[PDB]
Enzyme design. Structure first.
Site, PDB file in Angstrom:
ATOM      1  N   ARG A 174       0.890  -1.157   0.000  1.00  0.00           N
ATOM      2  CA  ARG A 174       0.000   0.000   0.000  1.00  0.00           C
ATOM      3  C   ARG A 174       0.918   1.194   0.000  1.00  0.00           C
ATOM      4  NH1 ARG A 174      -4.438   3.009   2.179  1.00  0.00           N
ATOM      5  NH2 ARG A 174      -3.963   3.935   0.150  1.00  0.00           N
ATOM      6  N   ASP A 199      -3.317   0.672   8.628  1.00  0.00           N
ATOM      7  CA  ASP A 199      -2.203   1.450   8.139  1.00  0.00           C
ATOM      8  C   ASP A 199      -0.895   1.366   8.926  1.00  0.00           C
ATOM      9  OD1 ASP A 199      -3.818   2.990   5.985  1.00  0.00           O
ATOM     10  OD2 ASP A 199      -4.891   3.508   7.843  1.00  0.00           O
ATOM     11  N   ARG A 200      -0.957   1.031  10.217  1.00  0.00           N
ATOM     12  CA  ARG A 200       0.275   1.040  11.022  1.00  0.00           C
ATOM     13  C   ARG A 200       0.596  -0.076  12.030  1.00  0.00           C
ATOM     14  NH1 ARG A 200      -2.631   5.263  11.401  1.00  0.00           N
ATOM     15  NH2 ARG A 200      -2.820   4.992  13.667  1.00  0.00           N
ATOM     16  N   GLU A 209      -0.009  14.548   3.206  1.00  0.00           N
ATOM     17  CA  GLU A 209       0.615  13.769   2.109  1.00  0.00           C
ATOM     18  C   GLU A 209       1.070  14.567   0.890  1.00  0.00           C
ATOM     19  OE1 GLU A 209      -2.732  11.143   1.642  1.00  0.00           O
ATOM     20  OE2 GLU A 209      -2.174   9.939   3.421  1.00  0.00           O
ATOM     21  N   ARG A 250      -2.794  17.453   0.370  1.00  0.00           N
ATOM     22  CA  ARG A 250      -4.156  17.037   0.648  1.00  0.00           C
ATOM     23  C   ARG A 250      -4.692  17.725   1.890  1.00  0.00           C
ATOM     24  NH1 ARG A 250      -7.194  11.989   3.413  1.00  0.00           N
ATOM     25  NH2 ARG A 250      -5.615  10.568   2.542  1.00  0.00           N
ATOM     26  N   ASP A 251      -5.870  18.329   1.768  1.00  0.00           N
ATOM     27  CA  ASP A 251      -6.528  18.985   2.907  1.00  0.00           C
ATOM     28  C   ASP A 251      -7.559  17.965   3.400  1.00  0.00           C
ATOM     29  OD1 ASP A 251      -8.329  20.463   4.620  1.00  0.00           O
ATOM     30  OD2 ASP A 251      -7.852  22.319   3.581  1.00  0.00           O
ATOM     31  N   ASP A 267     -10.029  16.780  -5.326  1.00  0.00           N
ATOM     32  CA  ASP A 267      -9.950  15.905  -4.165  1.00  0.00           C
ATOM     33  C   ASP A 267     -11.180  15.016  -4.183  1.00  0.00           C
ATOM     34  OD1 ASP A 267      -8.914  14.729  -1.902  1.00  0.00           O
ATOM     35  OD2 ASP A 267      -9.321  16.397  -0.558  1.00  0.00           O
ATOM     36  N   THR A 272     -13.727  17.332   4.945  1.00  0.00           N
ATOM     37  CA  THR A 272     -13.134  16.272   5.741  1.00  0.00           C
ATOM     38  C   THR A 272     -12.761  15.096   4.852  1.00  0.00           C
ATOM     39  OG1 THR A 272     -15.314  16.527   6.809  1.00  0.00           O
ATOM     40  CG2 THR A 272     -13.421  16.240   8.258  1.00  0.00           C
ATOM     41  N   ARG A 283     -12.945   6.171  -4.243  1.00  0.00           N
ATOM     42  CA  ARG A 283     -11.741   6.135  -5.091  1.00  0.00           C
ATOM     43  C   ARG A 283     -11.920   5.144  -6.251  1.00  0.00           C
ATOM     44  NH1 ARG A 283      -7.701   5.712   0.252  1.00  0.00           N
ATOM     45  NH2 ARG A 283      -8.196   7.862   0.929  1.00  0.00           N
ATOM     46  N   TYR A 330      -4.248   6.123  -4.036  1.00  0.00           N
ATOM     47  CA  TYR A 330      -3.299   7.249  -3.961  1.00  0.00           C
ATOM     48  C   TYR A 330      -2.667   7.564  -5.329  1.00  0.00           C
ATOM     49  CZ  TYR A 330      -3.282   7.733   1.157  1.00  0.00           C
ATOM     50  OH  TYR A 330      -3.648   8.034   2.448  1.00  0.00           O
TER      51      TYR A 330
HETATM   52 CA   LIG Z   1     -10.491  16.899   2.217  1.00  0.00          CA
END
Ligand SMILES: [Ca+2]
Ligand SMILES: *[C@@H]1O[C@H](CO[C@H]2O[C@@H](C)[C@@H](O)[C@@H](O)[C@@H]2O)[C@@H](O[C@@H]2O[C@H](CO)[C@@H](O[C@@H]3O[C@H](CO)[C@@H](O)[C@H](O)[C@@H]3O)[C@H](O)[C@H]2NC(C)=O)[C@H](O)[C@H]1NC(C)=O
Ligand SMILES: *[C@@H]1O[C@H](CO[C@H]2O[C@@H](C)[C@@H](O)[C@@H](O)[C@@H]2O)[C@@H](O[C@@H]2O[C@H](CO)[C@@H](O[C@@H]3O[C@H](CO)[C@@H](O)[C@H](O)[C@@H]3O)[C@H](O)[C@H]2NC(C)=O)[C@H](O)[C@H]1NC(C)=O
Ligand SMILES: *[C@@H]1O[C@H](CO[C@H]2O[C@@H](C)[C@@H](O)[C@@H](O)[C@@H]2O)[C@@H](O[C@@H]2O[C@H](CO)[C@@H](O[C@@H]3O[C@H](CO)[C@@H](O)[C@H](O)[C@@H]3O)[C@H](O)[C@H]2NC(C)=O)[C@H](O)[C@H]1NC(C)=O
Ligand SMILES: *[C@@H]1O[C@H](CO[C@H]2O[C@@H](C)[C@@H](O)[C@@H](O)[C@@H]2O)[C@@H](O[C@@H]2O[C@H](CO)[C@@H](O[C@@H]3O[C@H](CO)[C@@H](O)[C@H](O)[C@@H]3O)[C@H](O)[C@H]2NC(C)=O)[C@H](O)[C@H]1NC(C)=O
Ligand SMILES: *[C@@H]1O[C@H](CO)[C@@H](O[C@@H]2O[C@H](CO)[C@@H](O)[C@H](O)[C@H]2NC(C)=O)[C@H](O)[C@H]1NC(C)=O
Ligand SMILES: *[C@@H]1O[C@H](CO)[C@@H](O[C@@H]2O[C@H](CO)[C@@H](O)[C@H](O)[C@H]2NC(C)=O)[C@H](O)[C@H]1NC(C)=O
Ligand SMILES: *[C@@H]1O[C@H](CO)[C@@H](O[C@@H]2O[C@H](CO)[C@@H](O)[C@H](O)[C@H]2NC(C)=O)[C@H](O)[C@H]1NC(C)=O
Ligand SMILES: *[C@@H]1O[C@H](CO)[C@@H](O[C@@H]2O[C@H](CO)[C@@H](O)[C@H](O)[C@H]2NC(C)=O)[C@H](O)[C@H]1NC(C)=O
Ligand SMILES: *[C@@H]1O[C@H](CO)[C@@H](O[C@@H]2O[C@H](CO)[C@@H](O)[C@H](O)[C@H]2NC(C)=O)[C@H](O)[C@H]1NC(C)=O
Ligand SMILES: *[C@@H]1O[C@H](CO)[C@@H](O[C@@H]2O[C@H](CO)[C@@H](O)[C@H](O)[C@H]2NC(C)=O)[C@H](O)[C@H]1NC(C)=O
Ligand SMILES: *[C@@H]1O[C@H](CO)[C@@H](O[C@@H]2O[C@H](CO)[C@@H](O)[C@H](O)[C@H]2NC(C)=O)[C@H](O)[C@H]1NC(C)=O
Ligand SMILES: *[C@@H]1O[C@H](CO)[C@@H](O[C@@H]2O[C@H](CO)[C@@H](O)[C@H](O)[C@H]2NC(C)=O)[C@H](O)[C@H]1NC(C)=O
Ligand SMILES: [Ca+2]
Ligand SMILES: [Ca+2]
Ligand SMILES: [Ca+2]
Lengths: 388, 388, 388, 388
Positions: free
Chosen positions: D37, D70-71, D196, D211-212, D243, D265, D290, D325
């Protein structure tokens, strides 16, 4: 290093000698190996590399089913040192369902074609980067050689075709320097339909023995003048004839000028090369399907029309075994440039129905001036053993 | 770099020390590893590489069945850095069912033989290209060393045989420079039958301790004069005797001149080397089958006939384990050239009947002048564990 | 290049930072990965390589059963670029059931030991060749570091031991130049029992923090004078104590001179290094078994005896996870030489009984002068998931 | 070599051309391939390499279950030549659950972040060694680009964020030379929330289109002055908006200055780049999830606010397929520096529920000035075929 110029005479040969065999298929039965088709080989100044358009999957993979199809968005070109099989560590140099590749002396030039059949895009990647690109001109399957292009003094030639697979098409010769398209020459001469060219240096020009898919069984020739970008074309003289399908040797002929109009539609990527008034060629042994492979010189096969007198024959693949496409590749020696060739051995679907896949193996021979023997070197896989 | 000349004395040794082991077979039980036989090793100026003639398949492959056969069109030579096993990424440098390989100083020379037993072709590939080739001269299995050839001042020697596997044959020594055959010398001397030679530099000449397959248990010697291409031949003096089959040490003998005529038919690739009046050799421990391996010096074994006085013995493979072929390889040091050797450990079919395949493992030791111990290093695979 | 001299001060550190993790075991559950133990790391002038003594098989192999045993004739040393896992393409650089390795600046020195426990042989392979060898001196398991040796001005040090695993042994320091043994120094000083040394350059000498397996819980120090080949030895001062087994921090102590005689028998390969009057060390968190790993500086831990005052603690592996051996490796920077370390995370047999094998994973951290955090990085494999 | 300075104008483009595709997932169905990823690509002076944060397991591994997270302490960064898939031989260059990487001209700079979310540590590894490190400043997930950083005159920039994933955070720009942190600049300007980043050289400065994740659908810009380490920030002008999530093109807008406050958001790593008054961007075709990917130029999209006028559109991934992404990477040519991009195609869990894993594939296109066509190049795996 400086640019390759191919300035040395052709080596005088007696026949060919065994060079390499990858055994891809036997290995697929017990190992993760790629599904391929349309392979070829090129050599930079120091070593040869084998290429092929993969199918985006391993053979022993459910994704290998229905691999007969020539064009999907997942085919990419793979490159390895000649002799090491297409394993998972193999490198996919670009996205392509049709390609050609060559080394100018300084680096590699990869021409990869892909996208929608009616609106394809061909990329030119020089020294690891994308330098230029071109879009389809006839909107009907833009295509190219499926074997090495050639460069002289830093200019590499490539011949592409767009249009009817069995009618008038639009064939063009592209000149690119350092990855950039410097000129485009439209086909001229008597050749009625050019496909999957078979090019080799013949300083100061380049020569291609292509495939006629519409009205010819005899093969077209396309001479490219590296100087003024001039182009001449015709058909080989040899009364034998190296395409498939074809008429049997007794009911065959060519006049060096026009298609012989005998079982002309369809064909297979083939090859040949001049030797004074003589000609060296290779063709499948069967006149109907792609089975077997044999090579021979035809006394007077270049200069005299309808020449059938042959000699120095060798069978590479015996009558009973499957073959496929074929190409030539030139290698520079200490005093002469030598001519070599590979044979794509296809196995599987649409012909062998136990399995649902299609892939291939390769065998390559190089010319020699010494002595040799006889034998047969086919794929060698037991269709009954594993995978699908 | 310049050409290798091997101009340094031989190192004075006390015995041998463990160098490498590939463990191919244990690994085959859980990994995609090639099926091999007839391995060997060579080293270019910087590192050693291990070779072997593959069988065109992985061990855990249905295609491994009936691998006992020495000659099919799918065997090709594989090369890897000594110590990395024959995995799928391995490189098949040529098509060959019999080979020899050596580095002249500038590059590699590969002599690969293949085709029909009655009409084989042997290819000479120098610096990655096919430079020459030769066809069979007696039409009965053209063959060669199955281990490294040697070069001095850019000329590499190779000895081939054609003809009866148990009768008068036609043995010849080939001289090739830069891949090209420059001269051919026909065997001379008292040696009755030469096979699978075991060559090593002994400046200004080359020496081979070969295998006699017809009337001898003692081993033939073939001295090659790099100067006038002269050739002398005889049998080792040592009353012990290093071939298999053979008579037991009490009922053995040689006169340095003719075959001892004791259990002469058949044999196995073997080795030995001079040390003044002394001799260093290795042989299987059993006198009947290829089991075990031990090495020792025979005081006076070179100069005096029928010498049985031995010393400095070490067992590499114990009495209870299978071995196979064996070869030597020379390595250049800071002040002397050192002698090494490998042992092919074969497992499987025709001897172990649980499985239907045949493959092998290797172990290699190098001479030393220091101190060492004892032990045994065989293949190590449990025939009961996986694969067939 | 010229010879490494390690002439730069030590970098002043604040703690350590995450460097690499191979994840071998998680990968073994779905991939052909080697069975290992006793790993370590070294770096030549440009990059680091990870080593380990393999077990002659893949994990998912019937041959992995009963892998707890430390010494069989099939263990060989494997070398890969730090971070790429031990796959089938990995290289077996020599036959060894115990080793040490280092780069003098010009090339690699590999010291591999093998053979019968009562009569072992240790090989010295420099620049790819066998240069010297030595046989056992006490006939009771000849052994060495199991981590990098060090060279200064082209002379590399290595400390070996032969004899009682729990009684007076015979420890010696070997000096070898270009692969050849140039001198041998017998241990001297107050250190009662030396094992699996932990060496690092401290120009103009070399220092080792070893393992005491007989009467000590505190660790022995062995100072080697590269000049006159002199040797001094003692025990660390730190009242904490870094061996396992050991007494808890409240009932611990050392006087810098003799074994503390507390839970002295047994041990584990450990490490530490000087920082003025201070000391940086790492030990397993549990005092009984090899579980967890934490590091810290002990104020005054080098100069003052029985120093227990600690600070700058970080847990690498948490209380609940298995660890194993540990070593240090030095790396040259732009202005100072930096100290690093790895942790061997062992999984499987004799402790986790679901499986019948034994192997390991690694994690390595390097010193830093910046800021960092907290966390835990263990093996991470679910013993319940696949393989045996 | 000397340091990269990126001193050449930007190439003038017409659109993009197919470059590479790895086909990871189709291959996973029959081969040992890593679970990944957040991929990206960079190119040193001669060739491009593909990276991604692995998950510490192979896809066809029980350990791949619940890979959505993710972590974990097992994610490490993997690097391979662009086009060769993530096989077992792949190299794990460091421990990291978030990264960025770049080549200054002399070597590679890897910034890897890991540890506990509230107290993470980020390592700077230059030329193969650990040179510096930094600890979390807001104790709430320290993070960075997930794509290449850039260097000019030997100083490389990287932007990190710590804090609220949906509120005021603490964003900083780090300047590091030869692996060492030389200066730290705190964010300034009108940009409300940076994440990012998407950086590219624009000599003498660097520009990032980030990216906001809090109040914006439009994308923030962060201009970095390589000279005085000054920093400006804003939002793109283009009335379209790149976005996801976002409002449809009819109900969209931006004023170049503040968040548009529409479906602000959440978000996804995105990109864009200036072309005079114009802008080239790419976004997913769907405004909600996405899925799909298309690219186009927006006439006046950089200089004029709320610009919706678009042209030169191409679909990379069709409406019906999953993406993820995205990033950009710059490549130096003979006369201009060229802009490229990759698309991460994610498959599996939390969206496709047949399997219990999560991984991804990639496709990359490079700008061109020639002609091209149309098509669609998605992952291509049959979720129904094998693996879980
Ligand atoms: Ca946003
Ligand atoms: C390789 O190709 C053909 C077609 O497989 C495709 O199936 C679609 C749905 C998709 O997954 C794609 O990726 C596959 O390639 C397979 O041939 C089939 O053989 C069976 C034999 O019994 C046929 O049986 C019928 O199947 C239907 C459902 O399709 C059943 O409900 C019926 O009861 C009936 O049994 C099937 O239809 C065949 N289809 C064709 C066009 O021949 C082939 O099996 C596949 N797999 C393998 C291993 O080769
Ligand atoms: C490895 O070798 C032998 C021969 O296998 C070959 O089979 C031919 C057809 C071809 O596919 C080739 O690639 C194979 O290598 C196998 O030995 C056989 O063992 C079975 C034991 O039951 C014998 O049974 C008989 O087989 C016939 C059909 O052949 C049946 O119809 C009879 O009823 C009877 O059961 C078989 O004949 C054997 N043949 C010999 C010569 O021993 C061996 O099994 C094969 N496979 C493996 C896994 O080792
Ligand atoms: C791993 O190790 C132990 C021992 O296996 C070895 O077996 C010898 C013969 C050799 O092949 C060597 O390579 C192997 O490593 C295995 O443990 C065994 O577990 C079974 C459980 O039922 C025991 O059962 C008994 O086995 C005998 C034959 O040995 C039967 O005839 C009896 O009826 C009885 O069932 C077996 O003896 C165990 N032995 C010991 C010492 O525990 C283990 O299974 C093996 N395999 C695996 C997968 O881990
Ligand atoms: C992938 O993920 C989920 C959870 O698996 C985890 O299990 C824990 C114990 C640990 O091993 C960890 O590594 C695994 O990832 C699995 O989903 C499960 O599906 C079964 C369907 O029947 C559920 O059944 C119930 O299971 C319990 C024991 O847990 C039984 O005793 C009950 O009778 C009942 O059948 C199970 O609970 C599910 N759990 C969840 C949270 O959905 C999934 O199967 C796993 N494996 C695979 C192949 O994807
Ligand atoms: C093809 O290239 C060769 C190889 O580079 C050229 O050879 C040079 O040209 C002439 C021949 O002696 C001299 O001026 C140089 O001394 C040659 N040296 C080298 C290294 O090549 C050859 O001329 C080229 N052929 C053509 C037609 O241009
Ligand atoms: C390939 O390059 C050679 C090398 O220069 C060309 O041969 C020269 O031709 C130029 C003008 O074209 C003359 O000035 C030189 O005198 C010729 N030889 C050399 C060695 O310089 C040759 O014309 C080019 N050939 C092709 C097919 O492009
Ligand atoms: C074998 O090769 C060596 C190594 O190249 C030769 O050594 C050279 O020959 C003599 C000895 O000093 C001098 O003329 C040169 O200075 C040597 N230098 C180098 C680099 O080799 C050696 O003579 C060769 N042996 C024979 C018999 O030719
Ligand atoms: C190998 O080459 C060496 C190196 O030249 C040969 O030794 C020389 O012999 C020539 C004539 O053969 C003499 O002119 C030189 O004086 C000798 N030595 C050197 C260092 O030049 C040697 O004869 C060759 N040996 C073999 C076996 O071919
Ligand atoms: C360790 O090696 C370095 C690196 O090679 C030595 O540095 C040289 O020694 C002195 C210091 O300036 C000068 O004579 C040379 O100009 C230096 N140059 C280079 C490239 O190193 C250093 O002296 C060595 N340390 C010791 C104690 O010998
Ligand atoms: C490592 O080598 C250096 C480099 O020569 C040694 O330092 C020199 O010592 C010699 C005599 O030993 C003196 O002549 C030089 O003046 C000193 N420095 C240099 C840069 O040459 C050093 O002694 C050696 N150290 C070790 C531990 O072996
Ligand atoms: C960016 O780097 C290039 C490439 O190194 C610099 O070019 C040099 O600078 C000027 C331009 O001709 C001359 O002084 C040198 O002859 C150039 N040579 C080479 C090899 O680069 C370029 O100036 C750099 N750009 C900037 C702004 O510093
Ligand atoms: C990148 O480096 C170049 C190369 O030196 C810098 O350009 C020079 O600027 C210096 C002072 O900064 C002047 O003395 C030179 O006359 C200018 N050009 C050259 C080719 O030397 C440039 O300023 C640096 N740019 C960045 C963004 O750091
Ligand atoms: Ca035709
Ligand atoms: Ca015999
Ligand atoms: Ca102890």
């Amino acid at each position: 290093v400086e640019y390759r110029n191919w300035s040395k005479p052709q080596c005088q040969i007696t026949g060919f000698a065994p060079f390499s065999k990858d055994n891809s298929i036997r290995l697929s039965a017990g190992g993760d190996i790629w599904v391929t088709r349309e392979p070829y080989v090129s050599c930079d100044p120091v070593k040869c590399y084998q290429f092929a358009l993969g199918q985006g999957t391993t053979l022993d993979n459910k994704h290998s089913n229905d691999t007969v199809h020539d064009r999907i968005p997942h085919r990419t070109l793979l490159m390895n040192e000649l002799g090491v099989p297409f394993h998972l560590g193999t490198r996919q140099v670009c996205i392509a369902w049709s390609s050609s590749s060559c080394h100018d002396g300084k680096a590699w030039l990869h021409v990869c074609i892909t996208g929608d059949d009616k609106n394809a895009t061909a990329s030119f990647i020089y020294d690891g980067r994308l330098v230029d690109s071109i879009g389809s001109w006839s909107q009907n399957i833009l295509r190219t050689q499926e074997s090495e292009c050639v460069c002289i003094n830093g200019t590499c030639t490539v011949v592409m075709t767009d249009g009817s697979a069995s009618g008038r098409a639009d064939t063009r010769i592209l000149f690119i320097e350092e990855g950039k398209i410097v000129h485009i020459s439209p086909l001229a001469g008597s050749a009625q339909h050019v496909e999957e060219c078979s090019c080799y240096p013949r300083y100061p020009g380049v020569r291609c023995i292509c495939r006629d898919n519409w009205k010819g069984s005899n093969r077209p020739v396309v001479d490219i003048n590296m100087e003024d970008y001039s182009i001449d074309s015709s058909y080989v003289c040899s009364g034998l004839v190296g395409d498939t399908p074809r008429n049997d040797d007794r009911s065959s002929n060519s006049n060096c000028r026009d298609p012989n109009n005998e079982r002309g539609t369809q064909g297979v990527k083939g090859w040949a090369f001049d030797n004074g008034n003589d000609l060296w060629m290779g063709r499948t042994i069967s006149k109907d399907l792609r089975s077997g492979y044999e090579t021979f010189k035809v006394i007077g096969g270049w200069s005299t029309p309808n020449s059938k007198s042959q000699i120095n024959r060798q069978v590479i693949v015996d009558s009973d075994n499957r073959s496929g496409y074929s190409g030539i590749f030139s290698v520079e020696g200490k005093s002469c440039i030598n001519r070599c060739f590979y044979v794509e051995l296809i196995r599987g679907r649409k012909q062998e129905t136990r399995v649902w896949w299609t892939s291939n193996s390769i065998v390559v021979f190089c010319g020699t001036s010494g002595t040799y023997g006889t034998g047969s070197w086919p794929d060698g896989a037991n269709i009954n053993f594993m995978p699908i």
